[PDB]
Every structure is written in structure tokens, then in C-alpha cells.
Design an enzyme around this catalytic site. Structure first.
Site, PDB file in Angstrom:
ATOM      1  N   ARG A  80      30.142  21.886  78.531  1.00 25.40           N
ATOM      2  CA  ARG A  80      29.889  20.517  78.060  1.00 25.40           C
ATOM      3  C   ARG A  80      28.971  19.734  78.973  1.00 25.40           C
ATOM      4  O   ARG A  80      28.132  18.968  78.517  1.00 25.40           O
ATOM      5  CB  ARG A  80      31.192  19.738  77.945  1.00 25.40           C
ATOM      6  CG  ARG A  80      31.997  20.109  76.727  1.00 25.40           C
ATOM      7  CD  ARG A  80      33.130  19.125  76.510  1.00 25.40           C
ATOM      8  NE  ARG A  80      33.962  19.495  75.375  1.00 25.40           N
ATOM      9  CZ  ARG A  80      33.621  19.376  74.087  1.00 25.40           C
ATOM     10  NH1 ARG A  80      32.447  18.873  73.715  1.00 25.40           N
ATOM     11  NH2 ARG A  80      34.474  19.770  73.154  1.00 25.40           N
ATOM     12  N   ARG A  89      26.192  30.196  76.405  1.00 26.72           N
ATOM     13  CA  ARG A  89      27.255  29.649  77.246  1.00 26.72           C
ATOM     14  C   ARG A  89      27.094  30.053  78.705  1.00 26.72           C
ATOM     15  O   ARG A  89      26.524  31.112  79.045  1.00 26.72           O
ATOM     16  CB  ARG A  89      28.677  29.839  76.722  1.00 26.72           C
ATOM     17  CG  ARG A  89      29.105  31.250  76.480  1.00 26.72           C
ATOM     18  CD  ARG A  89      30.482  31.532  77.054  1.00 26.72           C
ATOM     19  NE  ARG A  89      30.741  32.927  76.758  1.00 26.72           N
ATOM     20  CZ  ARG A  89      31.933  33.483  76.616  1.00 26.72           C
ATOM     21  NH1 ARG A  89      33.055  32.777  76.757  1.00 26.72           N
ATOM     22  NH2 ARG A  89      31.991  34.772  76.330  1.00 26.72           N
ATOM     23  N   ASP A  92      31.880  32.899  81.412  1.00 29.74           N
ATOM     24  CA  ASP A  92      32.980  33.589  80.755  1.00 29.74           C
ATOM     25  C   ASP A  92      34.088  33.772  81.773  1.00 29.74           C
ATOM     26  O   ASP A  92      33.860  34.276  82.872  1.00 29.74           O
ATOM     27  CB  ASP A  92      32.539  34.947  80.181  1.00 29.74           C
ATOM     28  CG  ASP A  92      33.651  35.648  79.375  1.00 29.74           C
ATOM     29  OD1 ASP A  92      34.493  34.968  78.717  1.00 29.74           O
ATOM     30  OD2 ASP A  92      33.661  36.904  79.380  1.00 29.74           O
ATOM     31  N   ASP A  94      37.637  35.641  81.800  1.00 37.61           N
ATOM     32  CA  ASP A  94      38.488  36.575  81.093  1.00 37.61           C
ATOM     33  C   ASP A  94      39.733  36.882  81.942  1.00 37.61           C
ATOM     34  O   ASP A  94      39.658  37.018  83.165  1.00 37.61           O
ATOM     35  CB  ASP A  94      37.698  37.851  80.751  1.00 37.61           C
ATOM     36  CG  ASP A  94      36.667  37.629  79.662  1.00 37.61           C
ATOM     37  OD1 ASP A  94      36.684  36.554  79.031  1.00 37.61           O
ATOM     38  OD2 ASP A  94      35.839  38.534  79.404  1.00 37.61           O
TER      39      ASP A  94
HETATM   40  N1  LIG Z   1      42.192  38.918  78.253  1.00 37.24           N
HETATM   41  C1  LIG Z   1      41.581  37.850  77.691  1.00 37.24           C
HETATM   42  N2  LIG Z   1      41.001  36.882  78.442  1.00 37.24           N
HETATM   43  C2  LIG Z   1      40.400  35.828  77.863  1.00 37.24           C
HETATM   44  N3  LIG Z   1      40.307  35.658  76.522  1.00 37.24           N
HETATM   45  C3  LIG Z   1      40.845  36.548  75.655  1.00 37.24           C
HETATM   46  C4  LIG Z   1      41.530  37.728  76.215  1.00 37.24           C
HETATM   47  N4  LIG Z   1      41.970  38.457  75.176  1.00 37.24           N
HETATM   48  C5  LIG Z   1      41.605  37.794  74.043  1.00 37.24           C
HETATM   49  N5  LIG Z   1      40.923  36.662  74.324  1.00 37.24           N
HETATM   50  C6  LIG Z   1      40.447  35.716  73.271  1.00 37.24           C
HETATM   51  O1  LIG Z   1      39.125  35.976  72.885  1.00 37.24           O
HETATM   52  C7  LIG Z   1      38.441  34.757  72.598  1.00 37.24           C
HETATM   53  C8  LIG Z   1      37.013  35.155  72.885  1.00 37.24           C
HETATM   54  O2  LIG Z   1      36.309  34.397  73.833  1.00 37.24           O
HETATM   55  P1  LIG Z   1      35.069  35.127  74.557  1.00 37.24           P
HETATM   56  O3  LIG Z   1      35.113  34.744  75.985  1.00 37.24           O
HETATM   57  O4  LIG Z   1      33.670  34.608  73.960  1.00 37.24           O
HETATM   58  C9  LIG Z   1      35.157  36.943  74.402  1.00 37.24           C
HETATM   59  P2  LIG Z   1      34.062  37.678  75.623  1.00 37.24           P
HETATM   60  O5  LIG Z   1      34.568  37.479  77.018  1.00 37.24           O
HETATM   61  O6  LIG Z   1      32.642  36.954  75.415  1.00 37.24           O
HETATM   62  O7  LIG Z   1      33.896  39.236  75.353  1.00 37.24           O
HETATM   63  P3  LIG Z   1      34.913  40.273  76.037  1.00 37.24           P
HETATM   64  O8  LIG Z   1      36.300  39.872  75.565  1.00 37.24           O
HETATM   65  O9  LIG Z   1      34.452  41.608  75.506  1.00 37.24           O
HETATM   66  O10 LIG Z   1      34.624  40.096  77.512  1.00 37.24           O
HETATM   67  C10 LIG Z   1      39.104  33.702  73.462  1.00 37.24           C
HETATM   68  O11 LIG Z   1      39.078  32.415  72.843  1.00 37.24           O
HETATM   69  C11 LIG Z   1      40.511  34.232  73.671  1.00 37.24           C
HETATM   70  O12 LIG Z   1      41.492  33.556  72.877  1.00 37.24           O
HETATM   71 MG   LIG Z   2      33.567  38.863  78.778  1.00 37.76          MG
HETATM   72 MG   LIG Z   3      36.113  35.989  77.184  1.00 37.77          MG
END
Ligand SMILES: Nc1ncnc2c1ncn2[C@@H]1O[C@H](COP(=O)(O)CP(=O)(O)OP(=O)(O)O)[C@@H](O)[C@H]1O
Ligand SMILES: [Mg+2]
Ligand SMILES: [Mg+2]
Length: 154
Positions: A80, A89, A92, A94
């Protein structure tokens, strides 16, 4: 009670290193989260910048779902506040591991179901979590990590 978890952070736009450092700063300042360790940063190699990635060890009293909201609010916050009117974006966040738990929700998969095939995750993770068990494979991180020359220390 207190749980140990591991997060994976990535950014390939702007001052990438600041993004990562700012995400860690924000996370560390949520209630119920404290950052106990940080991997070195790695760079991964068409015309848009390379990713910087790292891994973060936290001690948290949050549920894994509450932790997810914190991760997304952190992505949201940095995004934002970006300068650039629109664009890809910035960050990330994760969730890689949460204790030795396995979680299968539509909105949430832990352990992250692709970590095992990604050097840019495993390599930094191995720097701070070599002896942690990944519960699906039942292997330790250090048993999963492999050499990948496209992943360089930054
Ligand atoms: N272990 C995890 N960590 C974070 N988000 C997760 C997750 N497992 C599922 N998700 C879900 O996936 C959605 C995707 O968001 P993103 O960050 O754009 C996926 P990404 O990280 O771009 O790809 P990736 O999952 O292959 O790394 C989130 O809103 C979340 O609810
Ligand atoms: Mg990712
Ligand atoms: Mg993600």
C-alpha cells in the site's frame, strides 16, 4: 504456549533489501511474535530484477491462522505504501513451518507444499534450521537441501 516457526520472505522490486528488512521489523513488532533468527540473504537469477530471499525463525504465541493474518498484513502494509502507482507486489511472506505440525486448509498449507523443490527456500532455511524436521517428508532440512548454482549469497 510458545511455538517455533519459520517464514520465507521474498522481494524482487525496488530496494529489495529494505523490503525484507522492513518486513522483519514489522513482524517482530506484532504482539505474540518475536524474531529469534535470520538467514543470510540469497539472490536468484527476464528483464525484471532478481529475487532476494531469506528465512526467518520466530517464536510465537499465535495460532498459525493468526500468524497468517500477520504475514498478509505485512505484505499489505508494504504494498500500500509503495511509491509506484501500480506494479507487481513488493513482498511475499510465506509460512514454511509451524512447529512440527501439518495443516491443510483451503487458505493455508503448512509445511509450505513447494518448499522441498525450491533451493531459494531450502538453502537459506538450512542456514538457520538444519535440524528441523519437515513433517510431510519426515526429513530434516539438512537432508533436503541441495546445491543450486543459480542461488548466490547476496
Ligand atoms: N504456507 C503458506 N504461507 C502463506 N500463505 C499461504 C500458505 N499456504 C496457503 N497460503 C495462501 O495462499 C494465498 C496466496 O498468496 P501468495 O503469496 O500470492 C502465493 P505465492 O507465495 O505467490 O506462491 P507460493 O505459495 O507458490 O510461494 C494466501 O492468501 C494464503 O491464504
Ligand atoms: Mg512464494
Ligand atoms: Mg505467498
Amino acid at each position: 504456549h510458545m511455538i517455533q516457526a519459520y517464514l520465507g520472505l521474498g522481494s524482487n522490486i525496488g530496494d529489495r533489501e529494505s523490503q525484507l528488512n522492513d518486513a522483519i521489523k514489522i513482524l517482530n513488532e506484532y504482539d505474540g511474535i518475536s524474531v529469534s533468527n535470520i538467514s543470510p540473504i540469497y539472490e536468484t537469477a527476464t528483464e525484471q530484477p532478481n529475487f532476494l530471499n531469506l528465512c526467518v525463525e520466530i517464536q510465537t504465541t499465535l495460532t498459525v491462522l493468526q500468524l497468517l493474518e500477520c504475514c498478509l498484513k505485512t505484505e499489505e502494509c508494504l504494498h500500500r505504501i509503495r511509491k509506484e502507482r501500480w506494479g507487481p507486489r513488493t513482498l511475499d511472506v510465506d509460512i514454511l513451518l509451524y512447529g512440527e505440525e501439518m495443516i491443510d486448509l483451503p487458505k493455508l498449507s503448512v509445511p509450505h507444499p513447494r518448499m522441498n523443490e525450491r533451493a531459494f527456500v531450502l538453502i537459506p532455511l538450512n542456514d538457520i534450521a538444519a535440524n528441523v524436521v519437515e513433517p510431510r517428508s519426515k526429513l530434516k532440512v539438512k537432508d533436503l537441501v541441495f546445491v543450486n548454482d543459480s542461488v548466490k549469497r547476496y
